[PDB]
Amino acid sequence: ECYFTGRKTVSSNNRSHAMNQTKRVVKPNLQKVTILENGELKTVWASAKALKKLPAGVERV
Amino acid sequence: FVKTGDTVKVIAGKDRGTTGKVIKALPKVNKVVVEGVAIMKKHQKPNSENPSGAILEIEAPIHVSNVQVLDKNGVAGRVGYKVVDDKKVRFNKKSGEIL
Amino acid sequence: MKRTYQPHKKSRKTTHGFRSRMATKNGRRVLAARRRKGRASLTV
RNA sequence: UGAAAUUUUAGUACCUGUGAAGAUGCAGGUUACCCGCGACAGGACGGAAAGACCCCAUGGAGCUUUACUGUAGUUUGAUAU
RNA sequence: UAAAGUCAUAUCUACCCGUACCGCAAACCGACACAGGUAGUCGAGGCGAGUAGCCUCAGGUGAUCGAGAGAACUCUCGUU
RNA sequence: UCAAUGGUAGGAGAGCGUUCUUAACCGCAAUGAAGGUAUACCGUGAGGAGUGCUGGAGCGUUAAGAAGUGAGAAUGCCGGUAUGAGUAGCGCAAGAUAAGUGAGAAUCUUAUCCACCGUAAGACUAAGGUUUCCAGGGGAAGGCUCGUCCGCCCUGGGUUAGUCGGGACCUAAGGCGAGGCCGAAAGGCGUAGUCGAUGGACAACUGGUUGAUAUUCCAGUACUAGAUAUGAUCGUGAUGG
RNA sequence: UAGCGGAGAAAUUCCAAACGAACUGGGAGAUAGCUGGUUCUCUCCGAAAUAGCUUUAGGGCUAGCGUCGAAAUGUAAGUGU
RNA sequence: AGCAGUAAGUACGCAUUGAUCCCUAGGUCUCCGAAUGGGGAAACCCAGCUGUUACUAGCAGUUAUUCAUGAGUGAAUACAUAGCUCAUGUAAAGGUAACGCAGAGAACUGAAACAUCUAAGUACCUGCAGGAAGAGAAAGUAAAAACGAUUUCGUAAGUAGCGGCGAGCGAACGCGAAGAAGGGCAAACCAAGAAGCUUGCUUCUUGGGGUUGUAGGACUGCAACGUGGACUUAAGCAUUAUAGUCGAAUAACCUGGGAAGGUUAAUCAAAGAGGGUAAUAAUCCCGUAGACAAAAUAGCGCUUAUACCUAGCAGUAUCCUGAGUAGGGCUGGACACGCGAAAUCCAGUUUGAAUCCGGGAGGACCAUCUCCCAACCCUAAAUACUCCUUAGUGACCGAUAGUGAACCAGUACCGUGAGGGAAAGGUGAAAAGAACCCCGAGAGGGGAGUGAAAUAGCACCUGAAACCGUGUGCCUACAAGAA
């Protein structure tokens, strides 16, 4: 689970050929990273969308 | 009522018109033992406090409807009360007003 | 022959004591069903 | 001292027929004082068992498979890391 | 480390729960004063290897409707 | 007058009875409402009143409306009563007499014999039972029968520890588990730690004692640990080893 | 160690007087072309048990077969001889 | 004006001086339990600290955790950091009637079977909340002038649609009614500080600026409107719950055990609602209609300055206006929408703008036109449901009903457990409950007496029905019946 990436592994539902009414489990991107040090020094998970928008504003946010 | 009391009429019921002194009403009973009135008698065993028994002229209580308080000239009715003085003044209607 | 329950005191508790039933967030729920009904007792 | 199962109620015989096609109770005919009591089992298609055999249900379960659909799982490749 | 120690010495104290009874059982668990089950420890003599028998120790018990009559029959026993 | 009137599933029409209906209409009722009961009336039917009696408070009318609304019958249900049937059984073992007890004794109590078990059918002790123990009294039910007896019932007492078993010690198997781990969530895992005896640690044992408690009450002997009172002396010596 | 499960010297064996899928509560008065049950009084009229189709044959959908009402009476059709 | 809950049942007593009682507030509040000093099976054990007061005591309090906030500490390793310690803040854990929201989410069914659908995103489960919640201020709908946030209801209307186009599911628009409130911020800028003080800093902190659609603000102009809205503060006013108070209006006769019934008369009137009373009451009582009453009590509402932030306005130097954002690919889902011509929105994943000459919508989409300005936040009101508090209402129901439960019901009882789950009210007006006497071991009876009544005698009104009877007139012991 990653906090500032928003949501979690959130449930969904699977389709098929002439769909058979099934289920999926949505998983986001899971990366434990520790990028910046503002007073941070804090390891935490992240998602790759938030990785590519680390240079959006994510050094303190 | 308020605490009876005095001689008290009995209009309806088994003994019409009978008047008799009261003090002992206990209004939670909602029917009043009055001397002379509703003459119960008990065939009691020859036991403690009466080693013969067989006769107890204790008398039955009769309902508030058949209690009728008179003011002191023997005049009953409806108790207008609290009306006159410091805490409370009892009286009946068409009455000589005394308590 | 042999029957089911020949319990001892540890046996009569340790499934149904107030902390046992209270423990797992679940048995206390069905105890609260037993309270919202409110039968002769609670814990046994 | 004292129950159970039990059942339309029935003072409920026999033969020969008849009949949802095998009679106690029906037709014809026969024998039978009334009521019991101790033992017995041929019936009363005796009970107890909405057949566990067979069959049916667009009935369900379980099992099997190279039925059809899938699922996880297993193994590619893409692609952010 | 100075009586913390420390022994003599002296007299007090020493908490809380459980403690009765039954328990191979009419209280247990077998709906029952039920013909089951139920730890463990001891468990006499006499013969007798023997904790098997068998009769009496110590000990405990008469276990719960009976009398008749000895049918047939039914079942446990003894014969041929 | 003529013609019609077997009739199931079928369909149409009509009417009865119950209850509530604020309705009104309009009475009854203690001289007896309702309801019950007998009844030798009437009505095509369903149904209706009359009288006798119980009985002592609500009920009836009419007309109309509204309906949980018209009872046999389903393993219908619930409650009661049969039936079989005075039959089965009376729950694995033998008592016996005399005397008491009482009102009433087989079955209660005693005496005296018999009998049985006796590696038990003894005693003592787990779990269990949760007062069943004992004393006195009683016999509504219970006792598989009786019953003065009782594990039945009323009342009252009865269980005593520094050393007995546990806890104030430790810990397995295990459980819970702050930290942490992962996980829609709840959660599930788990380091430290924490409890967890059936285990390992440790002082008391003889005699007497009741209706009943005894290693517990007390005679005798202890020992364990601490205390305060008291000549030490540097001593204690840890979670480490 | 708990049911989509467990255990299992394995039979489909057991999982609290008891299991090829445990027990308790809810869904949910699951469902049921199949069984049973159906309650007051009268009058009048009065059946079918067949065709056609149907995963249909012990069931439905029409049509034939009743009943009542209405519109006229194809200007008589009907039904006989 | 007696008290001495239940109710007998006793006793010391207690009390118009004012009790008992009613209400309001305060008090203490055993233990467990969120349960929390530590352990622990619920009614436990063992503590530590601080004073107490005495003891190998006792008392009183402090000592669970997480979070937040400080303070100190300070390892590898110098600072630091982790980590540790202390202090402060119920915060906050927890119990929860029903409604909500959000996540997670089936099956059975039905489709005459069934794989698509349905059931329904419902059953369940978890979390988050309040008195309601969400809900919301157009990056909207619509299509011509057409309006102007939402919400609920009716309508449109099963209309448009979708769908093994089966079986089904299913709108919106517009209109009608209720209810009818929008307001901030970041941004841009301006000022202050501190700082990359690497100077001119181009990041942070404070306060103005202003929240925008026909653009709006900043820059140049320039106006003080009460405001839950530009302060839903405090002070008075008023009144309600929260104790209750007063409160009218009648006599006789007949009957009976008893009148309110029948009969004779009279009254009242904001009270002839209803309930008791031995038997049906307006005038007997409670009451009732009205009319008064509360200090404390929880409020509601009105007036007051204050409890504070807003306006118009012309012009447009340039900036701003909500970036991984819209979008695009794929996989989903919701939207009536089942991938379809598929809109439009929201997810994962990937790619990625423009930014006022802008951008978006107008059911693929390309131009013209209409409307709007997202990608920042809050918003009462009309609505949903009651465990609850009364005020109550009944063509509700009368003890198999009515709550499982009118009764010591969730009781007994079953089951180890989760669970299940019963049966039962009525004497008499009043116990006035049968003194005594006799039978009887006792109970029970029988007399007496009791009461209107004793078939009325303690599970007692009324008492069928099956069952058992006892008496009774007739008939049957040569008979083989749906009786």
Question: What is the 3-class SS of B49-92, one letter each residue?
Answer: CECCCCCCCCCCEEEHHHCEECECCCECCCCECCCCCCCCCCEC
Hey, what amino acid is at B14? Answer: K
CB B35 within 8 A of CB B49: no
How many CA atoms are closer than 13 Å to the CA of B95, on its beta-carbon side? 20
The number of C-alpha atoms within 13 Å of A33 and in the hemisphere containing its C-beta is 18
Distance B24 CA to F155 C1' (A): 40
Nucleotide closest in space to C25 (CA vs C1'): F186
The two tokens of residue A20 are 């058979």
Report helix, strand or coil for B27.
helix
Residue type, C2: K
**Which residues 4-43 in chain C have a CB closer than 7 A to strand F?**
7-9, 12, 23-25
Q: Whole-number Å distance, CA A39 to C1' H199? A: 28
Q: Which of residues 1-44 of C touch strand E (CB under 7 A)?
A: 1-6
Task: Judge if the beta carbon of B99 is closer than 7 A to nucleic acid strand H.
Answer: no
Provide the CB-side half-sphere exposure for B77 (13 A, CA): 19
User: Contact, A44 vs A34, CB < 8 A?
Assistant: yes
Which residue, B12, B56, B53, B5, is CA-closest to B27?
B5
Tally of CA atoms within 13 A in the half-sphere of C22 that contains its CB: 5
Cβ atoms B1, B64 nearer than 8 A = yes
Distance of B66 CA from H303 C1′ (whole Å) = 60
Nucleotide closest to residue A8 (CA–C1'): F184
Query: Other CB atoms closer than 10 Å to residue B53's CB: what's the count?
Result: 14
- Distance in angstroms: CA B46, C1' F24: 65
Asked if B97 and B72 touch (Cβ cutoff 8 Å), the reply is no
Question: How far, in Å, CA of A32 to CA of A19, rounded?
Answer: 36
Give the resolution in Å: 5.6
Take residue B28 and report the two structure tokens written for it: 């939670």
